[PDB]
């Protein structure tokens, strides 16, 4: 939609996204919001990070891919930002969202072939 | 003395398909939900439709809400006559009562109420007003002895609602409406 | 150096099991899983929160 | 009962009398300019001073208090004591200062009405004596200081137990505690006995009455859930709101207006009802943006009716009325408007009355429909009191243009109507 | 850098030697920072001097990453404008509740 | 036709209405210190349809 | 001081004095009545 918010995922890779975020809730493996998100940044904890295509204003989040950019994380816009919401399982929208480090967790496997698919679409 | 049927199939990230099925399978229309992560349940209503049925081909009438209740809890909620005119809808409203997935949707067959219900905790029944698109307040209460709903039945002429759980035991009531 | 990153590895793993307790604390039903390794996980029913 | 219960009420009778010098200091110690240590020391003489001189500047801001300057205001009332007078004159002296509140309760942000009600407290000892008035005159200022000084001299009323909570602290009271307050319902009838006696003597002002329709309001919204609560809120509120229409004033016709609008919206009413409530809002609507209100919210309550025989036509004289008030010219540039508020019913209603009764303005009537997408059965209702007009009078050119018209738009519903009465 | 950080570090922004030395000897942290002296935070009173401080950081951190990172800025401050609306609707609302009893 | 069908061209007309719940005015109390009474009326109904 | 003997404005008073019950209910509409359900358990 907004022709700032660069890597837009497609339906496949969207539903892929949105069922790894939907374990990565249900396993609490999850930080939600642009500032939870921007801390985790910060510690440096983040497997990977998804935002919202369709948060008007966009640089609320536009914030976030310079930070992911040098700290060599990676990034995608999913075009929904209820859907996310609906996804990270909370009853607002969320723009922004973080799959956070932990190796022995039970969706190892699933949220490193969907971070190797993200860092397809950046490469 | 003529009809035609529409078939409409959702997927699991919220992509309606609209095929016909008098001429074969050809599909009229797509278009997608907002929001909708998973949704698992899709329902029309307000017409005639499989669970408040048609008697002779003139009492057919065309439906006029469309509802659509996903996993997390969260049921959308469209208005026909402007959906397919605007062929990627925004919704009537959206009902966020329920927490947990949506296993049941019945229409009245009016389609006056709107009956949303869960299957995976107790007590997990909603009736919804219809166009306020707003939930009844005093019923049921916490002393309502639904068990985990798993089948509810409108009455077609009566205007009884059926409810049955887990344990077995189905449960009338009547609407004094009707 | 080698020092710094060897106390800065132990410091990240206390912290990970000290927010593991802590969100055992708030809300929810948790299930108890035993890995059959014999270690303990948890796991959240899937119900959306408010 | 008890002993200290009889002599709580001997003391309460004997609230204001000084029988020695310690409650002397006390009660002329309390007083709204000065504080204890000189209102502890000054005098009538000083007080009325001050007094005399405010009225002065009160009387050539507003010229009605020169008969508080011949009565209230004079040296005989410094002489008189209000304790010794029998009943009768204690009855007199409460209306002249009950007129003098209603007066004076329009100007309290200012220092000359704050003088010259110094003068009556600390002479006539309002502020115990009769603080309802006081309150409920003053009691739309609410965030002001000079409504905290009043809180912290009164002792409260039964009724005012909220402000018997926040009496002598430093925060205002807050605009849900002034909910709570109207939220009582004995409340609700002394103020609107109170608003009734301020409208008969025709002085009311905007900033009050914008206070009063607003917890008016917000108590219909908060007792919203209880049928019967807004049932038995019905007869106060719609009282009010017959007085508050029969006014004169613009700004009382629309805020009765918004009593009414909200009220028929929160409560679905009776057709008797709501037609009684338009006759009286016709049978005084003078002003023009107070025709526009009344436009607005006769539409909103003729909307809000859904029942049976909902949409049946205007009777008689309430048709005459609202045509002699609303002329055609005004209705269709209210219909040509451009933010569209939905008015289907009070339409259909009024074409089915035109249809009846006047039977010449059917080109009006083809204009009304071409500006409006009316429902399927009051499409289905015009055509059938246009299929009987046909039958009965005789066929007329605009009638054939009707016909016309609904046959380019939806002449399977006219092929349904003659099926139903026909060939 | 103002818009790349947080919003809570706006917030805490001011307060960071009690910030630091409340956490390297567990106790709590303040909760104004530099925020105090705004106009917002000036008519608050006691715990809604804290909330206020935190609701008008939120909305300090959206308006800056707006303006820092912005292609086509209006110079208008319409977001601001919204921002200011929101938080002092917030406001009104939290001092309209009360604590004690009626 | 039928009269079944008369009620539920009655009902599928009957479109939707906002319903006024238990909090819905208070923006006015907070705005009402030195506005006019058109202007307030417009504001109730602003917030009622 | 009482004794009994265009569109008035008493009308909303005289109407208000006549009735008892004001919210109707020989409607009988063939609509639904919003966030309160008449239901029985059977």
């Given at each position: 939609?907004?022709?700032?918010?660069?890597?837009?995922?497609?339906?496949?890779?969207?539903?892929?996204?949105?069922?790894?975020?939907?374990?990565?809730?249900?396993?609490?493996?999850?930080?939600?919001?642009?500032?939870?998100?921007?801390?985790?940044?910060?510690?440096?904890?983040?497997?990977?990070?998804?935002?919202?295509?369709?948060?008007?204003?966009?640089?609320?989040?536009?914030?976030?891919?310079?930070?992911?950019?040098?700290?060599?994380?990676?990034?995608?816009?999913?075009?929904?930002?209820?859907?996310?919401?609906?996804?990270?399982?909370?009853?607002?929208?969320?723009?922004?969202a973080?799959?956070?480090?932990?190796?022995?967790?039970?969706?190892?496997?699933?949220?490193?072939?969907?971070?190797?698919?993200?860092?397809?679409?950046?490469? | 003395?003529?009809?035609?049927?529409?078939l409409?199939?959702?997927?699991?990230?919220?992509?309606?398909?609209?095929?016909?099925?008098?001429?074969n399978?050809?599909?009229?229309?797509?278009?997608?939900?907002?929001?909708?992560?998973?949704?698992?349940?899709?329902?029309?209503?307000?017409?005639?439709?499989?669970?408040?049925?048609?008697?002779?081909?003139?009492?057919?009438?065309?439906?006029?809400?469309?509802?659509?209740?996903?996993?997390?809890?969260?049921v959308?909620?469209?208005?026909?006559?402007?959906?397919?005119?605007?062929?990627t809808?925004?919704?009537?409203?959206?009902?966020?009562?329920?927490?947990?997935?949506?296993?049941?949707?019945?229409?009245?067959?009016?389609?006056?109420?709107?009956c949303?219900?869960?299957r995976?905790?107790?007590?997990?029944?909603?009736?919804?007003?219809?166009?306020?698109?707003?939930?009844?307040?005093?019923?049921?209460?916490?002393?309502?002895?639904?068990?985990?709903?798993?089948?509810?039945?409108?009455?077609?002429?009566?205007?009884?609602?059926?409810?049955?759980?887990?344990?077995?035991?189905?449960?009338?009531?009547?609407?004094?409406?009707? | 150096?080698?020092?710094?990153?060897?106390?800065?590895?132990?410091?990240?793993?206390?912290?990970?099991?000290?927010?593991?307790?802590?969100?055992?604390?708030?809300?929810?039903?948790?299930?108890?899983?035993?890995?059959?390794?014999?270690?303990?996980?948890?796991?959240?029913?899937?119900?959306?929160?408010? | 009962?008890?002993?200290?219960?009889?002599?709580?009420?001997?003391?309460?009778?004997?609230?204001?009398?000084?029988?020695?010098?310690?409650?002397?200091?006390?009660?002329?110690?309390?007083?709204?300019?000065?504080?204890?240590?000189?209102?502890?020391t000054?005098?009538?003489?000083?007080?009325?001073?001050?007094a005399?001189?405010?009225?002065?500047?009160?009387?050539?801001?507003?010229?009605?208090?020169?008969?508080?300057?011949?009565?209230?205001?004079?040296?005989?009332?410094?002489?008189?004591?209000?304790?010794?007078?029998?009943?009768?004159?204690?009855?007199?002296?409460?209306?002249?200062?009950?007129?003098?509140?209603?007066?004076?309760?329009?100007?309290?942000?200012?220092?000359?009405?704050?003088?010259?009600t110094?003068?009556?407290?600390?002479?006539?000892?309002?502020?115990?004596?009769?603080?309802?008035?006081?309150?409920?005159?003053?009691?739309?200022?609410?965030?002001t200081?000079?409504?905290?000084?009043?809180?912290?001299?009164?002792?409260?009323?039964?009724?005012?137990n909220?402000?018997?909570?926040?009496?002598?602290?430093?925060?205002?009271?807050?605009?849900?505690?002034?909910?709570?307050?109207?939220?009582?319902?004995?409340?609700?009838?002394?103020?609107?006995?109170?608003?009734?006696?301020?409208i008969?003597?025709?002085?009311?002002?905007?900033?009050?009455?914008?206070?009063?329709?607003?917890?008016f309001?917000?108590?219909?919204?908060?007792?919203?859930?209880?049928?019967?609560?807004?049932?038995?809120?019905?007869?106060?509120?719609?009282?009010?709101?017959?007085?508050?229409?029969a006014?004169?004033?613009?700004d009382?016709?629309?805020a009765?207006?918004?009593?009414?609008?909200?009220?028929?919206?929160?409560?679905?009413?009776?057709?008797?009802?709501?037609?009684?409530?338009?006759?009286?809002?016709?049978?005084?609507?003078?002003?023009?943006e107070?025709?526009?209100?009344?436009?607005?919210?006769?539409?909103?309550?003729f909307?809000?009716?859904?029942?049976?025989?909902?949409?049946?036509?205007?009777?008689?004289?309430?048709?005459?009325?609202?045509?002699?008030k609303?002329?055609?010219?005004?209705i269709?540039?209210?219909?040509?408007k451009?933010?569209?508020?939905?008015?289907?019913?009070?339409?259909?209603?009024?074409?089915?009355?035109?249809?009846?009764?006047?039977?010449?303005?059917l080109?009006?009537?083809?204009?009304?429909?071409?500006?409006?997408?009316?429902?399927?059965?009051?499409?289905?209702?015009?055509?059938?009191?246009?299929?009987?007009?046909?039958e009965?009078?005789?066929?007329?050119?605009?009638?054939?243009?009707?016909?016309?018209?609904?046959?380019?738009?939806?002449?399977?519903?006219?092929?349904?109507?003659?099926?139903?009465?026909?060939? | 850098?103002?818009?790349?950080?947080?919003?809570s570090?706006?917030?805490?922004?001011?307060?960071?030697?009690?910030?630091?030395?409340?956490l390297?000897?567990?106790?709590?942290?303040?909760?104004?920072?530099?925020?105090?002296?705004?106009?917002?935070?000036?008519?608050?009173?006691?715990?809604?001097?804290?909330?206020?401080?935190r609701?008008?950081?939120?909305?300090?951190?959206?308006?800056?990453?707006?303006?820092?990172?912005?292609?086509?800025?209006?110079?208008?401050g319409?977001?601001?404008?919204e921002?200011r609306?929101?938080?002092?609707?917030?406001?009104?609302?939290?001092?309209?509740?009360?604590?004690?009893?009626? | 036709?039928?009269?079944?069908?008369?009620?539920?061209?009655?009902?599928?007309?009957e479109?939707?209405?906002?319903?006024?719940?238990?909090?819905?005015?208070?923006?006015?109390?907070?705005?009402?210190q030195?506005?006019?009474?058109?202007?307030?009326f417009?504001?109730?109904?602003?917030?009622?349809? | 001081?009482?004794?009994?003997?265009?569109?008035?404005?008493?009308?909303?008073?005289?109407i208000?004095?006549?009735?008892?019950?004001?919210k109707?209910?020989?409607?009988?509409?063939?609509?639904?009545?919003?966030?309160?359900?008449?239901?029985?358990?059977?």
């Amino acid at each position: 939609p907004n022709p700032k918010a660069f890597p837009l995922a497609d339906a496949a890779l969207t539903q892929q996204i949105l069922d790894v975020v939907q374990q990565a809730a249900n396993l609490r493996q999850l930080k939600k919001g642009a500032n939870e998100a921007t801390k985790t940044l910060n510690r440096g904890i983040s497997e990977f990070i998804i935002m919202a295509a369709d948060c008007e204003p966009i640089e609320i989040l536009l914030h976030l891919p310079l930070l992911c950019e040098d700290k060599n994380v990676p990034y995608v816009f999913v075009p929904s930002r209820v859907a996310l919401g609906r996804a990270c399982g909370v009853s607002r929208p969320v723009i922004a969202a973080s799959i956070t480090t932990n190796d022995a967790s039970a969706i190892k496997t699933q949220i490193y072939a969907v971070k190797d698919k993200i860092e397809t679409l950046l490469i | 003395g003529k009809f035609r049927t529409i078939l409409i199939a959702v997927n699991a990230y919220g992509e309606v398909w609209e095929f016909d099925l008098n001429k074969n399978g050809h599909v009229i229309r797509r278009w997608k939900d907002q929001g909708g992560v998973g949704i698992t349940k899709i329902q029309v209503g307000g017409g005639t439709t499989t669970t408040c049925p048609a008697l002779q081909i003139s009492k057919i009438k065309q439906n006029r809400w469309l509802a659509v209740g996903s996993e997390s809890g969260f049921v959308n909620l469209y208005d026909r006559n402007n959906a397919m005119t605007s062929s990627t809808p925004t919704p009537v409203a959206a009902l966020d009562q329920l927490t947990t997935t949506i296993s049941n949707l019945q229409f009245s067959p009016d389609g006056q109420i709107l009956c949303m219900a869960s299957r995976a905790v107790k007590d997990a029944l909603r009736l919804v007003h219809l166009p306020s698109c707003s939930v009844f307040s005093n019923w049921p209460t916490s002393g309502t002895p639904l068990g985990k709903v798993t089948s509810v039945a409108f009455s077609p002429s009566g205007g009884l609602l059926a409810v049955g759980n887990e344990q077995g035991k189905v449960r009338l009531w009547k609407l004094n409406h009707y | 150096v080698k020092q710094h990153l060897q106390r800065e590895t132990q410091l990240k793993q206390v912290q990970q099991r000290m927010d593991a307790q802590r969100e055992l604390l708030k809300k929810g039903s948790k299930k108890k899983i035993v890995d059959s390794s014999g270690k303990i996980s948890f796991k959240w029913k899937k119900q959306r929160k408010r | 009962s008890s002993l200290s219960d009889q002599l709580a009420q001997v003391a309460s009778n004997n609230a204001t009398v000084a029988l020695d010098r310690k409650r002397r200091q006390k009660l002329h110690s309390a007083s709204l300019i000065y504080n204890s240590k000189t209102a502890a020391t000054q005098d009538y003489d000083f007080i009325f001073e001050n007094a005399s001189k405010a009225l002065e500047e009160l009387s050539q801001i507003e010229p009605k208090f020169a008969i508080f300057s011949r009565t209230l205001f004079s040296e005989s009332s410094i002489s008189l004591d209000r304790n010794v007078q029998t009943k009768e004159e204690i009855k007199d002296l409460d209306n002249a200062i009950n007129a003098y509140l209603l007066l004076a309760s329009s100007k309290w942000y200012l220092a000359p009405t704050l003088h010259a009600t110094e003068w009556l407290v600390r002479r006539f000892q309002i502020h115990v004596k009769n603080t309802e008035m006081l309150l409920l005159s003053t009691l739309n200022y609410y965030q002001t200081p000079v409504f905290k000084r009043i809180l912290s001299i009164i002792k409260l009323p039964p009724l005012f137990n909220c402000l018997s909570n926040f009496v002598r602290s430093e925060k205002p009271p807050t605009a849900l505690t002034m909910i709570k307050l109207f939220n009582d319902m004995d409340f609700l009838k002394l103020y609107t006995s109170y608003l009734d006696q301020c409208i008969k003597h025709n002085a009311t002002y905007t900033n009050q009455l914008l206070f009063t329709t607003c917890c008016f309001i917000n108590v219909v919204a908060f007792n919203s859930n209880n049928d019967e609560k807004l049932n038995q809120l019905v007869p106060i509120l719609l009282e009010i709101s017959a007085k508050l229409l029969a006014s004169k004033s613009k700004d009382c016709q629309i805020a009765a207006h918004t009593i009414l609008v909200v009220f028929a919206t929160a409560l679905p009413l009776k057709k008797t009802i709501i037609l009684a409530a338009m006759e009286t809002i016709l049978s005084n609507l003078d002003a023009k943006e107070a025709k526009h209100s009344a436009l607005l919210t006769i539409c909103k309550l003729f909307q809000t009716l859904k029942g049976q025989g909902n949409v049946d036509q205007l009777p008689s004289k309430i048709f005459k009325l609202f045509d002699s008030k609303f002329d055609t010219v005004s209705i269709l540039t209210f219909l040509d408007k451009e933010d569209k508020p939905v008015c289907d019913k009070f339409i259909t209603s009024y074409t089915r009355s035109i249809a009846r009764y006047d039977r010449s303005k059917l080109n009006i009537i083809l204009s009304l429909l071409k500006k409006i997408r009316l429902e399927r059965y009051e499409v289905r209702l015009i055509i059938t009191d246009l299929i009987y007009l046909s039958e009965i009078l005789e066929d007329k050119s605009q009638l054939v243009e009707l016909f016309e018209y609904f046959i380019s738009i939806n002449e399977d519903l006219v092929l349904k109507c003659l099926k139903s009465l026909g060939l | 850098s103002l818009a790349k950080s947080p919003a809570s570090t706006i917030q805490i922004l001011g307060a960071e030697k009690a910030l630091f030395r409340a956490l390297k000897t567990k106790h709590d942290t303040p909760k104004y920072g530099l925020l105090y002296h705004a106009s917002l935070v000036g008519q608050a009173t006691g715990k809604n001097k804290g909330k206020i401080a935190r609701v008008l950081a939120a909305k300090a951190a959206v308006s800056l990453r707006y303006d820092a990172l912005a292609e086509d800025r209006d110079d208008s401050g319409d977001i601001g404008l919204e921002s200011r609306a929101k938080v002092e609707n917030r406001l009104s609302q939290l001092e309209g509740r009360d604590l004690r009893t009626t | 036709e039928d009269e079944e069908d008369i009620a539920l061209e009655f009902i599928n007309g009957e479109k939707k209405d906002k319903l006024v719940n238990m909090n819905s005015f208070t923006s006015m109390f907070d705005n009402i210190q030195n506005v006019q009474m058109d202007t307030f009326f417009d504001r109730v109904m602003k917030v009622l349809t | 001081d009482e004794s009994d003997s265009n569109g008035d404005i008493n009308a909303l008073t005289k109407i208000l004095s006549t009735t008892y019950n004001y919210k109707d209910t020989l409607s009988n509409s063939k609509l639904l009545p919003p966030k309160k359900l008449d239901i029985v358990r059977l």
